[PDB]
Amino acid sequence: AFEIIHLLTGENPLQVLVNAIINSGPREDSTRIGRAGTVRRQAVDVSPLRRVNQAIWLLCTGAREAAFRNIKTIAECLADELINAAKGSSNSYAIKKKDELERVAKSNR
Amino acid sequence: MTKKRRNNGRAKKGRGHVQPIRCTNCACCVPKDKAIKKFVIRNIVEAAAVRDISEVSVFDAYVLPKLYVKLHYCVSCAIHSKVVRNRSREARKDRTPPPRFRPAGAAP
Amino acid sequence: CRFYQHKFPEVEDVVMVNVRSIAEMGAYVSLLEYNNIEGMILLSELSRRRIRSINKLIRIGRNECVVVIRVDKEKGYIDLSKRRVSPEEAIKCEDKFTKSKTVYSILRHVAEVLEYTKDEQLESLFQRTAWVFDDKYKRPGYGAYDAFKHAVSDPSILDSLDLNEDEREVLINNINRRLTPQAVKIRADIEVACYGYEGIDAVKEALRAGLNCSTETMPIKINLIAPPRYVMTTTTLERTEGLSVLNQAMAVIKEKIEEKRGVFNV
Amino acid sequence: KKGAKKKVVDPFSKKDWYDVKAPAMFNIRNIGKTLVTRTQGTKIASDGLKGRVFEVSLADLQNDEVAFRKFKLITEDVQGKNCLTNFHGMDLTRDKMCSMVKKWQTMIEAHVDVKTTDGYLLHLFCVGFTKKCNNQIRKTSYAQHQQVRQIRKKMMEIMTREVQTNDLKEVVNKLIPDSIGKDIEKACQSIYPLHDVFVRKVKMLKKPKFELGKLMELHG
Amino acid sequence: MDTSRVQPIKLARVTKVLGRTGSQGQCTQVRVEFMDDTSRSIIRNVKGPVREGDVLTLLESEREARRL
Amino acid sequence: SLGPQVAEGENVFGVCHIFASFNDTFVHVTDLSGKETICRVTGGMKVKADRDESSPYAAMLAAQDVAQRCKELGITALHIKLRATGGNRTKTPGPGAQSALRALARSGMKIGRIEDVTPIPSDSTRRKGGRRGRRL
RNA sequence: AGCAGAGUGGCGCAGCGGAAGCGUGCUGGGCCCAUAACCCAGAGGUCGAUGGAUCGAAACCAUCCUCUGCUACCA
RNA sequence: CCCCAUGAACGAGGAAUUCCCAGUAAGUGCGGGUCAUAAGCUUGCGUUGAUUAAGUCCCUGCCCUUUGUACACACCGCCCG
């Protein structure tokens, strides 16, 4: 992964990953709250420890998903997924799904 | 016929009729002597917003006004809102109000 | 490609979507009222009442009318809602959805022959032709279908701006095939109650004069439904030119028959 | 498809700013600012500017401390971008009026209709409260009904004497430090001590003609 | 007229944790210091596991928590 | 937008007329007199859901716009008048009373005074709901 | 004969310019200790003929036939 | 049990629902049991080895107190036209 990231763009390939984690962590999140036996939602904040855990989850789902019928190997898929996260461009599974949560959190707040 | 309370649950003594009051939550008719009365004194401003209002106010030391609300509950609304709780046979005879903070200073 | 004059929807506009997935938090859906751009519906703003079932409401493979609540112009997040929808809006949107489909099918014949190896082909045709047809008549409630419908019945509309080739035949054929046969609901209302025996020949003179100032060779549609009732479907235009043909003709038959004996219906 | 202009109406660039001046009896006379639309021949500036009310505090019109005794002032005349005011009646805040009312006191109230030396007519509303006394061990401060009706009678007697004589301006001068209310507090003290007297409202009911000469005296 | 003008990203830090709330204990009441004003403090509801002294990323401080 | 010709050391004082309670929040900024007025915004205009019209953030988002147009004109300070519904009703503020203040103050506008105003009868006509009142 | 409807893909009603539409039933599963209520899952297939536009036609539009509904006569 | 040939459904699964907090879950093999011949079962054992939580009474259920009862075959009870 790091090998492909370094050839492909040319950086200290850890700075890629650190941006990729920080850009994928949500700023606000929703949860459930029970009123009248019907679904209502409430916006709440998120821990830094939550952000890191979420951001690591999200991007790893991308490469797992892509290589499920592609000729491309998971290594290639994963290094592509850290680029599009490290520079936001919404071609990743992560930066999409990040913005979905925040778009909900605006609505019900 | 068993009598759960000596007072029948109201403050009627030496009187034939007492004017009804409307419950604040459910508008039900309740006798004024059976209604659960709560006086609520609150600042108009919430404690968090006091700083922002003092910084934006043209006056260096503005005394914030208070809301004075006399809430009138029926027995059902007062149990549902947990304003009054169920008590044991003996603890029903006690008429002491439950101790609050202490006093109206600072945190409460 | 785009089915609509603007590429991106606005704020508070009625649109149509087609469900492609069902989300936990609502419904992520593709548009077919614009590009195939993504728009997200949320669970809270679908109804104002409970919800027992869930697949007897929204499900995959359904056109659903909705209102665009917010849009991020730069990002391309089209926030969506189904909470404010009236059946009157559904009629208006179903028409615009259906009309865009037929108009884009007309603007597909153009692309069958021209260079269309890339998807953006139809986009090139759409912007240059569609906008000058519909923008001129969008404020009065017309779509680009009105402009094309006007061209088939009077050809100056599509000759006022760049005329394509081979398009014109298929354009004419598809306009004239689908939006006809083409029609008169003109029926005469005539009542007569003769005591005459010369009524049989009297009626013949009256029938042939349904339209004044026409040739003796004019073809018309005579209909006899009952003995006093004489229905003449007069010269078939659009029923906005044969109004005088319908109204004044009724006076002829009722007048001609009173002269030969007795009182009649007016 | 129109004239010049540009776009939307901006009804707030067709409006004209003004100033609002108080009587000379107030130390700070600069009340504030209002706006009306510019003159048209179908409705002129002054006709849409007169007959207003202007709530202003007492600790804001009289620098400075008191936080109530709000006064109403009406614009009776306009003079070249300065709107001159006239007394209309005073009122009181809610919270102060509420806080004084409490359990184990007996509230005492009365009003009178009264005329000035001039043509002004007023309708004053006062209030008294019983004192929680010097060194009670009792948890009540209730009074007899006979005692109350005396206190009400004597609260009218004082408030008619000082307002039937003494013209419009001198009335106002007595109410700003509250000399009126304080006079009642001591005069009723023997028959029950009492703490508090305020005049929660006054309502100017009728008033005489404009009288330009008498008008400009106030803004002299 | 179009969209909205919004405040910039704020940062505020924990001073103390108060207790857990929600209907499964999933929300946590917390007191936070504004990190630019040291006498300002707001109460919040925060989802994730927090300790004390860690910093959050608030999108607004208009919002304020109560209990439900 | 044309303001007055001085506001440099002084302020111009408007009245804010915040409305309180449920299913609705108004903010309606007016003159001192209240005879004429400026922009008027509701929480039903910011948020459409027919159920978040009384919410905190809907009241904050409202005042976050209204307070811009104030300073755009030249109104810089605000006296505040409250209104709960009253008239033999709930007579208690909604959620969006505390809310709008916190937002509009920190947007940059000054606060001059604050008070409670509510229409409270001295006993008046019978309240809707009947003898037994609402249940469920 | 004028007008109207239809000419099943389980039933009954036949929905619209995207190949079962609606309501119902039958059969099976789920929930429950169990039943009802409630929630899900089904099913060989130009939908009378002759044509046109169409990517396609019960359904987009015509030309014909038949059965019925209302009206009603040639015989 | 072995050898050659034949080459189907099935391309991630509705309504619902089970189990699990550290050498634990999951992946992976082995021994014992039954056994003349024979484990897709059960019982033990090693090997590789995560993510998520440090909570709560919302659902399901249980313990203690107070309260109400026309129930005691105990609400799956009882009972009305």
Swiss-Prot record, chain B:
Chain intervals with Pro residues compositional bias: 98-108
Record protein name field: Small ribosomal subunit protein eS26
GO terms for biological process, alphabetical: translation
Any GO molecular function: mRNA binding
Location(s), subcellular: Cytoplasm, Cytosol; Cytoplasm; Rough endoplasmic reticulum
Quaternary structure and interacting proteins, as annotated: Component of the 40S small ribosomal subunit.
UniProt xrefs under Gene3D superfamilies: Ribosomal protein S26e (3.30.1740.20)
Gene Ontology cellular component terms for the protein in this record: cytosolic ribosome; cytosolic small ribosomal subunit; rough endoplasmic reticulum
Region entry Disordered, spans: 85-108
Family to which this protein belongs: Belongs to the eukaryotic ribosomal protein eS26 family.
Biased composition (Basic and acidic residues): 87-97
Keyword Zinc: yes
Keyword annotations: Cytoplasm, Endoplasmic reticulum, Phosphoprotein, Ribonucleoprotein, Ribosomal protein, Zinc
InterPro entries according to UniProt: Ribosomal_eS26, Ribosomal_eS26_CS, Ribosomal_eS26_sf
Taxonomic lineage: Eukaryota, Metazoa, Chordata, Craniata, Vertebrata
Function: Component of the small ribosomal subunit. The ribosome is a large ribonucleoprotein complex responsible for the synthesis of proteins in the cell.
UniProt cross-references to Pfam families, sorted A to Z: Ribosomal_S26e
UniProtKB/Swiss-Prot annotation, chain E:
GO biological process, one term: maturation of SSU-rRNA
Pfam families xref list: Ribosomal_S28e
Localization (cell): Cytoplasm, Cytosol; Cytoplasm; Rough endoplasmic reticulum; Nucleus, Nucleolus
Gene3D superfamilies assigned: Nucleic acid-binding proteins
Coiled-coil region: none
Modified residues (N-acetylmethionine): M1
One annotated Gene Ontology cellular component of this protein: synapse
Organism domain of life: Eukaryota
Residues bearing PTM Phosphoserine: S41
Keywords annotated in UniProt: Acetylation, Cytoplasm, Endoplasmic reticulum, Nucleus, Phosphoprotein, Ribonucleoprotein, Ribosomal protein
InterPro entries documented for this protein: NA-bd_OB-fold (IPR012340), Ribosomal_eS28 (IPR000289), Ribosomal_eS28_CS (IPR028626)
Predominant subcellular localization, coarse grouping: cytoplasm
A GO molecular-function annotation: structural constituent of ribosome
Function: Component of the small ribosomal subunit. The ribosome is a large ribonucleoprotein complex responsible for the synthesis of proteins in the cell. Part of the small subunit (SSU) processome, first precursor of the small eukaryotic ribosomal subunit. During the assembly of the SSU processome in the nucleolus, many ribosome biogenesis factors, an RNA chaperone and ribosomal proteins associate with the nascent pre-rRNA and work in concert to generate RNA folding, modifications, rearrangements and cleavage as well as targeted degradation of pre-ribosomal RNA by the RNA exosome.
PANTHER family for the chain: 40S RIBOSOMAL PROTEIN S28, SMALL RIBOSOMAL SUBUNIT PROTEIN ES28
Assembly and binders: Component of the 40S small ribosomal subunit. Part of the small subunit (SSU) processome, composed of more than 70 proteins and the RNA chaperone small nucleolar RNA (snoRNA) U3.
Family: Belongs to the eukaryotic ribosomal protein eS28 family.
The protein, known as: Small ribosomal subunit protein eS28
Species this chain originates from: Oryctolagus cuniculus
Organism taxonomic ancestry: Eukaryota, Metazoa, Chordata, Craniata, Vertebrata
Swiss-Prot record, chain F:
Family that this chain belongs to: Belongs to the universal ribosomal protein uS11 family.
Function: Component of the small ribosomal subunit. The ribosome is a large ribonucleoprotein complex responsible for the synthesis of proteins in the cell. Part of the small subunit (SSU) processome, first precursor of the small eukaryotic ribosomal subunit. During the assembly of the SSU processome in the nucleolus, many ribosome biogenesis factors, an RNA chaperone and ribosomal proteins associate with the nascent pre-rRNA and work in concert to generate RNA folding, modifications, rearrangements and cleavage as well as targeted degradation of pre-ribosomal RNA by the RNA exosome.
Pfam families (UniProt xref): Ribosomal_S11 (PF00411)
Cross-referenced NCBIfam families: PRK09607.1
Domain of life: Eukaryota
GO cellular component, one term: nucleolus
Assembly description: Component of the small ribosomal subunit. Part of the small subunit (SSU) processome, composed of more than 70 proteins and the RNA chaperone small nucleolar RNA (snoRNA) U3.
Identification of the protein by name: Small ribosomal subunit protein uS11
